[PDB]
Amino acid sequence: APTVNTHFGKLRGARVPLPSEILGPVDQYLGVPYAAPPIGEKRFLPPEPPPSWSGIRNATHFPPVCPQNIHTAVPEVMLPVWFTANLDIVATYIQEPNEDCLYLNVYVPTGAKPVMVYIHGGSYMEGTGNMIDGSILASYGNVIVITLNYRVGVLGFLSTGDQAAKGNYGLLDQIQALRWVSENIAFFGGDPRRITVFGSGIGASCVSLLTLSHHSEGLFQRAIIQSGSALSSWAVNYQPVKYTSLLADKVGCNVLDTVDMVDCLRQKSAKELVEQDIQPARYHVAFGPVIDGDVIPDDPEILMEQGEFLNYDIMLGVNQGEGLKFVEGVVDPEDGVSGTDFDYSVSNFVDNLYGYPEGKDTLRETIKFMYTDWADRDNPETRRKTLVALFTDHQWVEPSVVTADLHARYGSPTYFYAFYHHCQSLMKPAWSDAAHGDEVPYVFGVPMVGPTDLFPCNFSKNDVMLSAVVMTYWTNFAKTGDPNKPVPQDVAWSKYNPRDQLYLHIGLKPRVRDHYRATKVAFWKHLVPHLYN
Amino acid sequence: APTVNTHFGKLRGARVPLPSEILGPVDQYLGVPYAAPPIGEKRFLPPEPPPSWSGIRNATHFPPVCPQNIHTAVPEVMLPVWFTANLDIVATYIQEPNEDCLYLNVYVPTSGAKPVMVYIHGGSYMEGTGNMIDGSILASYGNVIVITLNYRVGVLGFLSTGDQAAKGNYGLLDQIQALRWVSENIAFFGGDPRRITVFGSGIGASCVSLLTLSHHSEGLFQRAIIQSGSALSSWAVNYQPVKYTSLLADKVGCNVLDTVDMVDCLRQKSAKELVEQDIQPARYHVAFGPVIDGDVIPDDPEILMEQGEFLNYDIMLGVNQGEGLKFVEGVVDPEDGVSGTDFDYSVSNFVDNLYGYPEGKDTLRETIKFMYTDWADRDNPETRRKTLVALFTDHQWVEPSVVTADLHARYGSPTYFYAFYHHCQSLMKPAWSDAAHGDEVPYVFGVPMVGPTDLFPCNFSKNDVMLSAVVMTYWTNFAKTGDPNKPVPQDVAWSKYNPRDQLYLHIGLKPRVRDHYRATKVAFWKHLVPHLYN
C-alpha cells in the first residue's frame, strides 16, 4: 500500500514491477488533482488551488481526459507518427473525455531525487499524458517522473484579444501544476531544487514558452525541448480574434461585446465546442498561445534576446526526418518524386508560408536551387530526401538552432543533439528517416520492455542499448545539469557555444560534431529575409 | 646540317642535344616565314602567302618579335604569374620588336609520320611571343613535332572599325594562315597532316576555342587542347570595338570623316606609337581583341557552340585550382587573411565591374556573398581569402570551360576534362597559393627534366619530374590517337566526359577520377545568377 501525505491530504498508489528483472519496481500514484476543476465559472479563468480531501484518495486508475476529439480534422503534419498511425489504440485512451481533467500521475523509484515533469502535446487540440508510462526511466535512472493533463483546445487556448478572454490557459495549468510539484514533491522523496520539465513536439513549444514566462520564475531549473520551439510558424497564434469570432459564429453566440460572448460560451457544452471544425492557415494554428502581455508580454524572440531563459540549463535537439508528412502525400511507388511534383510542392510551400510578397519568384527559384543536389540532379529519391529536408530545416532545425545560439550567448550551459536513429516498423515507410516522435520510445525506455500497442516496432538489442544511453544522458542532465556527470557510459557530450556549435550525433554510433547543417541554417536565417520585403 | 625542303624552298636548322641523357636530341628550324610581311599596305589586311626563295634559308636564330610593349599598362589579372613575376627576363626576349614578325619555329624529334602540335601563346592580346617556350623537351619525350608561331598582336593585330574599313581579327587570320602552312608543308618534316592538334594557355586557349568555332579553320586540324581559357570569358571577345578604335584614333590625331581614310592614316603612322598608346578598357574587359565580324566569327560564340561547329574536333580542356590569384593579392594582409570589410568591398566591386548596376543588384550582391562564405568557419580570415580566390576562379575560368565541355559532349563527341591541383614551389608566387594562372605550362613542356631555368626558377623535386612525365604522356597520347590513355600506358585511366556523368581527371601528385567538378558553383553561376536580376 504505497501511501504519500501531501499539503492537501493522503493518497495511495500502487507498486508495479517492470517486466524485466534488471530494473526494480516503481511506485506510481495515478490521477492526483493539482487544481480546482475548471468548470462553470472557472472556465476561461486561471487555475486555482484544488480543494482538500479528508480521507485517503485512491490513486490507482486514470481519470477522464480533457474534452478532445481525434476524429475531428486537425493539422496532420504536426501530430507524431505513432499517434496518427495508431489512432485506433489512441481511441482506447481517449474515450470518455471530461472537463474535470486537471490531474497528474507520479512514478517514484523504490537522498532526494531530481524531478522530471513531462508535458505532452499533439497539436494544441488533442493529447494526454495518459499515453506514456514513466515507470521504466524512473527505474533505470532513479528519477521521480510526473505526467500531466492540462486544459486543451478551445477551453485551453481561446482568446478574445482582451480582458474578456486573455487565453494561454494551458500554460497557466502547466505553471499551476509545476507549483504543485515544487511545493509537494519533497513528500515523495524528490528534490525541489532539481526540477526539469520536458516535452516533445507541441509540448516542447509549451516548455520553451514557459522558460520565457515571468510566471515560471523559480519553479524549475532545467528543461529539455525536444523537436519543438517557440519560434515555429505554428507555435503562437497571431490572429486569435478571427478564429474566436468564427467559433462564436458557428455555435451561434456572435455578439459585439466580448464579455457577453464569453459568458455565452461558458454555457455551451464542451462536446459542442470540441466537435467544431476550424481550419486555420496551412502550417498555422487556430487556437493556441497568444501575446497577452501578462504570460507572454512580447514576441518570443524578443524575450529571448532580452535574456529571461539564460538562467536555466537547457538541452534540446532535432530529428533528421521530422517533416516526413510534408512529402508523404506525393511519393510514388518508385520511392521518388518527379520534377513537376517537386516544383508544385515547393511553390505551394512558398505560397503558404510567405503569402505572395513582392519578389516571390526570386525567392522560389532560390529555394529550388538551394535544395537541389546538383551532383545527382536527375535522381528522384534524392529529390524526395531534399523535399523532406526543406520542411525539416525550416520548421524544426532553424528555430531550435537560433534558440541555442540565443541561450549560450553569455556562456549559460546548453546542449544540442540530433537523433539519427529510429525503430523499424510498419507505422512508417521503410525509406523514411527518423520522423517526428520516433525519439519518444527511446527516452521513455520502450526498448527495455519491447514492442507495445503504441509502439509495435520490432526492437533489437541495439535498440535497447541506444535507449539506455539516451535515457542515461537525460537522467544525468537532470541530476547535475551535465549529461556526462555523474554516471559514465560503459563519448563525452561537450557544451554548445556560438562559435564552436558543438553538438552530439545520437545514433548507433554516437559522436561529437560541429555546425549541424550550418549552411542551410544560415541560408534560412540570413539570406532569406533579404530577398523579399 | 639539318635541312628540309618545302613548297617555298630549302631551310637549314640545327640539331641540339637535351641536357638529360635519356631524351634524345631534336632538330629545330627557327624563323620559318609562313606569310608575307604585313607592313605598310598589307597592314590591317588578311595575311598573304610568303614569297619563295631560291637558295637555302638560314633558320638558326629568332626573328624580331611583333611590335609590343611590356612596360605599357596591361590587365595584370590576365597575364600568367611566371610572366609578370619574371618581367625582367621577359624583357630580354621582348627587346627589338619589329612589324615583320610573321614567323614560326619547328622542333622535330630525331616510328612513322608523327603527330603535330601547334602552340598558340598569349598573355593579354597585347603582349607575348612563342619564342620564350622551347618545345624540345616535349618533342623528344613524346616523339611528336612541335611548332611555336608568332602572330600579329595589339593594335596591328585586332584593330576594328566595325565595318569593311577594318574588320579586324587579324591575329586569328594569322593563326589560320600558319595552320594552313603547316598543314600543307609538315609532311616534308616527317609529320602527319591528318594528325594535327592546336593548343594554347590563357589567351592562347581562347584563340584556339575561337578557331574551332571559325568556318575558316575547317579541315586544317583535327584535335585541340584548351587550357585555362575559353571563348565565353568576359575578356575573350571585344563587344565595343568602335569606341576604343575611335579613342585610339583621337589619341594619335588620325581623326577624319571616312573610316577608310582613318585606317589609311593609321597605316601612315609608325608601328611603335600605335603600341605605346594607353587605352585602358573596362576592368576585366579587353580594349583590342577579336570582334563579331560576320566573316571569321559570324555570331556570338555560344550561338556557334549550340549550332554544332566544333563537334568534329576532339577536345581536351581543363582548369587550375587558384587561377584568380591576382583578384585577391592586393588585399591580403601579412597574416594571410582578409577582413570582412575587405571581403564585402571586393565582392561589391566585382559586382559593379561585371554587371554594371542592373535592377536587383542589391539582392544579387547578398546572394553572392552568402554563396562564397564558409559558414562552418565564418570568422576565419584564411578561408575567407580562399573563398575570395575561388569566386574569381569559378566565374572567370571554371564555369565557361564547363559550359564548353557540356556543349561539346552533348551528342557524344569525345571530350576530356581535367583539373590541375599541383604547382612548383618558388618565390614568384606566395607560399599560401594553389596552382594559379600559368602554373601548368612548365609541366606540359617538361622543364622539370631540365631543372630550374630563367623563366621558371622553381625548385623542382622528383615528384615534379614524375608528374610532368605523366602529363606530357597524356598530352602526347591524345595528340597521337585522340585517347589520353592510348597507346602508351602510365608507368588510372582518363574516362570520357559526358553531360550526365561529368567525369574528370584530378591531375596532381595523387591522380584519380572524380565527377561533377564544383557542380554546385557551376550551377549557381549558370542558372541562379541569370534569374536573380531581370
Residue numbers in the entry:
A (entry chain B): 41 to 150, 198 to 577, 591 to 633
B (entry chain A): 41 to 150, 197 to 577, 591 to 633
Which of the paper's sentences describe this entry?
Neuroligins are postsynaptic membrane cell adhesion molecules that connect presynaptic and postsynaptic neurons, mediate the transmission of signals between synapses, and shape the characteristics of neural networks through specific synaptic functions. NLGNs belong to single transmembrane proteins, and they all consist of a large extracellular, acetylcholinesterase-like domain (CLD) and a carbohydrate-binding region, following the transmembrane region of O-glycosylation helix and the C-terminal intracellular region as postsynaptic density zone (PDZ) recognition component, which mainly binds to postsynaptic target proteins such as Gephyrin and postsynaptic density protein, thus promoting synaptic differentiation and strengthening the stability of synaptic space and the function of transmitting intersynaptic signals. The ectodomains of NLGNs can form specific cross-synaptic connections with neurexins (NRXNs) of the presynaptic membrane, and these connections can be regulated by the membrane-associated mucin (MAM) domain-containing glycosylphosphatidylinositol anchor (MDGAs). The NLGN structures were highly conserved in both human NLGN2 and human NLGN3 dimer forms as two symmetrical elliptical spheres, and the interface comprises a four-helix bundle including two helices from each protomer.
Although the NLGN3 was used at full length, the size-exclusion chromatography and SDS-PAGE analysis showed that the molecular weight of NLGN3 was similar to NLGN2 ectodomain, with NLGN3 slightly earlier than NLGN2. As the C-terminal flag tag was used for purification and NLGN3 can be purified successfully, it is possible that the C-terminal of NLGN3 was too flexible to be seen in our case. For modeled human NLGN3 dimer, the protomer consists of an α/β hydrolase fold, a 14-stranded central curved β-sheet surrounded by 25 α-helices. The interface area is about 789 Å2, contributed by interface residues including H615, T619, F623, L627, W461, A462, F456, and A622. The overall structure of NLGN2 and NLGN3 protomers is very similar, with root-mean-square deviation (RMSD) of 1.518 Å over 522 Cα atoms. However, when chain A from NLGN2 and NLGN3 was superimposed, the orientation of chain B from NLGN3 has a rotation relative to that from NLGN2, indicating the distinct arrangement adopted by different NLGNs. The interacting residues were mapped to the previously identified patches A–C. The results intuitively showed a slight difference in patch B, where F408 of NLGN2 was substituted by Y431 in NLGN3. The single mutation R451C of NLGN3 is the first single-nucleotide polymorphism associated with ASD. Among them, R451C is a well-known mutation that is closely related to the development of ASD and has recently been found to enhance the gain of function in excitatory synaptic transmission. This residue locates in the central helix of NLGN3, and the mutation may affect the intracellular traffic and membrane localization of NLGN3.
